[PDB]
Design a protein around this ligand. Structure first.
Ligand SMILES: NC(=O)c1ccc[n+]([C@@H]2O[C@H](COP(=O)([O-])OP(=O)(O)OC[C@H]3O[C@@H](n4cnc5c(N)ncnc54)[C@H](O)[C@@H]3O)[C@@H](O)[C@H]2O)c1
Ligand SMILES: NC(=O)c1ccc[n+]([C@@H]2O[C@H](COP(=O)([O-])OP(=O)(O)OC[C@H]3O[C@@H](n4cnc5c(N)ncnc54)[C@H](O)[C@@H]3O)[C@@H](O)[C@H]2O)c1
Ligand SMILES: [Cl-]
Ligand SMILES: [Cl-]
Lengths: 361, 361
């Protein structure tokens, strides 16, 4: 079978780290296995433009392997041309770069599988880190040191402890729950969640969380809000001007989920106006983020409150080996004809939604 | 009585934030309270040089109030000129900017009091933040964004999860233990500590910590080392070239304790050479840190591994009110002649060591 693998290029950085499996140079470390199994592997990072390498090979690819950090956007237009496509794999977590609703509406017999759980710890750590960086005003503090300055008050005037703050997560699944678990020993005033899926009651009690029934009530009382739900029709553009106006004034917002859950310019305006004290995360729409994307230069009134990074929290070296192995396992389930996928990896099975986490179906 | 209060200046930043008690503009909230009692309060940030405002007032100061973030260095030379000095207060935690050994060894009848516990949560939070920032390679990641670039592999090549790492604290007192507590839900491989004061078994078991009684054995197995002991003769220069050569190669080192626990040039050489992958923290010797201090510009081979900030973790707005109130309480205990200090606040009582945490006596 013909397999098209779209990853980020490491360029000169490939020579620095052999454990960087998630790049085009290294092919998830599964190329030997795919060659021995008798398959043809096309590897590229060229995913934009009508004559990209991706588009040249879409018409007869049996399988497309993608990765969220450099996402091949498997649009309706591409799906219609993909005459042999039977399986799309996500080397990572989050399948929103594929037009899942289109596959489902047309009933096309395409399965979509992701490596659930492979980098959920990595993401939760990044949430905790970004919360602490924003609350404690770390970015301008480090900027002072490397700019050869020293002025404690310029940092302290907007630096707080996370202790005593009320923290809310939108989405309390694998990442959201792991965030709540990691926050417990920081002595927050309270931990809150909003999710149409209730936490198991034992899990709720372990972290002292309180479920809040609607999102407006959730954000209005939160000093810190974190977004940990997938991107789907019910979350696209969820964090917009109107909802942001119901946040607690001066809240901190963290989003390692998906960029498009927020309206980009609305977040930036809330930060510039003071409605938010800070925003940070690793995810953008689209990716790669253009040089002039508004989340790069946005700041609060003090010139800070920006903890943005490129999309990498789920591609730490520890995460990469896990989602590479999980990608291999998915492919093997397909190649053998067993289709013995782990239940939690299945987004679509031959066009049908199996996941419950991408809204109600 | 004549009181000399040495704090940092907030300048234009005082107007941005009324909760900034710890600057010369706002005088810990005690200026009118002192004036009403008939005391003369001299407030200054001018603390260096033979005719500094501090030195002008040392000879007849009854009380000197200091703060670690802008520390008046109460050296033996100054103590010898301080003919009326009876009490040095630390608005914060850590009394090493005072020559405690000289006071004690020469029979100077000077008490030294600090606001124990007032910002130990704040410091522990900063340790967790710095560990995450270094391990997850946040600083170059944010720099890439604000420089209008996008290259996931440039960051991922040296980005790890904290999960699965072995973490060691040198010092397991209020901050060190709070660090261990916050690390538990991050699923480290193991938590280790080295302290001449053992943790109670119950405290050890709560965080799953293992005591290591030899410092070289401790650092040799640790992916991450954090310093959480006071600065005294026993810890000054403890982190030198020879001990660093026994660190695990490519370890991360966090120091929010005191800068002079490390030999500054030895740390920088270890970072540049790769013996450390990263160093970070908020504390320097001396403070303010000179523009040429080697910890400003030091980097690892990738241009990263530096998470330095100015000394602010213990002067977040949440901390400042706690140590301002604690300073007022200490002063009242002195002025009333009750001397009913909280026992945990007493470093020296009339020259004698009461604390056990500054070495054995
Ligand atoms: N930044 C990264 O590198 C990275 C890494 C992993 C995952 N992610 C993203 O995080 C998302 C969540 O990952 P996970 O492992 O926690 O997934 P998960 O499926 O375990 O949990 C998602 C939770 O979100 C809930 N949810 C769905 N819609 C919601 C809505 N409108 N409001 C509130 N809750 C809603 C779901 O019910 C579920 O409980 C992924 O889908 C992915 O987009 C990013
Ligand atoms: N960066 C900040 O703003 C900030 C804030 C608060 C405290 N600090 C610094 O952190 C230090 C510790 O604070 P704390 O509240 O945890 O103090 P603490 O007195 O509760 O704990 C200090 C621990 O260090 C141990 N110790 C002393 N010498 C040691 C040695 N050679 N090796 C190993 N352990 C040793 C002590 O036995 C004690 O258990 C303070 O003295 C201060 O210098 C910095
Ligand atoms: Cl929904
Ligand atoms: Cl000692």
């Amino acid at each position: 079978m013909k397999i098209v693998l779209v990853l980020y290029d490491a360029g000169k950085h490939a020579a620095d780290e052999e454990k960087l499996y998630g790049c085009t140079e290294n092919k998830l470390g599964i190329a030997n296995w795919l060659k021995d199994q008798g398959h043809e592997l096309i590897t590229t990072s060229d995913k934009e433009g009508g004559n990209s390498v991706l588009d040249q090979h879409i018409p007869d690819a049996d399988i497309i392997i993608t990765t969220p950090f450099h996402p091949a956007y498997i649009t309706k237009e591409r799906i219609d041309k993909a005459k042999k496509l039977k399986l799309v794999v996500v080397a990572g977590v989050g399948s929103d770069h594929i037009d899942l609703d289109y596959i489902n509406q047309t009933g096309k017999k395409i399965s979509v599988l992701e490596v659930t759980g492979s980098n959920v710890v990595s993401g939760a750590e990044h949430v905790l880190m970004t919360m602490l960086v924003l609350v404690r005003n770390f970015v301008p503090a480090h900027e002072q040191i490397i700019n050869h300055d020293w002025e404690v008050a310029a940092i302290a005037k907007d630096a707080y402890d996370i202790e005593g703050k009320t923290i809310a997560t939108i989405g309390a699944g694998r990442i959201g729950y792991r965030v709540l678990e990691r926050l417990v020993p920081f002595n927050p005033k309270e931990l809150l969640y909003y999710d149409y899926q209730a936490l198991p009651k034992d899990a709720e009690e372990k972290v002292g969380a309180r479920r809040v029934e609607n999102i407006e009530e959730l954000v209005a009382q939160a000093d810190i809000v974190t977004i940990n739900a997938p991107l789907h029709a019910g979350t696209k553009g969820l964090i917009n001007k109107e909802l942001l106006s119901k946040f607690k004034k001066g809240a901190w917002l963290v989003n390692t989920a998906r960029g498009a859950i927020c309206v980009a310019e609305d977040v930036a305006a809330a930060l510039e106006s003071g409605q938010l004290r800070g925003y940070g995360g690793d995810v953008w729409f689209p990716q790669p983020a253009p040089k002039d994307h508004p989340w790069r230069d946005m700041r609060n009134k003090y010139g800070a409150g920006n903890a943005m990074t490129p999309h990498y929290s789920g591609t730490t070296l520890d995460a990469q080996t896990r989602y590479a192995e999980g990608t291999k396992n998915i492919l093997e389930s397909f190649f053998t004809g067993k289709f013995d996928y782990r239940p939690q990896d299945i987004i679509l099975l031959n066009g049908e939604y199996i996941t419950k986490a991408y809204g109600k179906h």
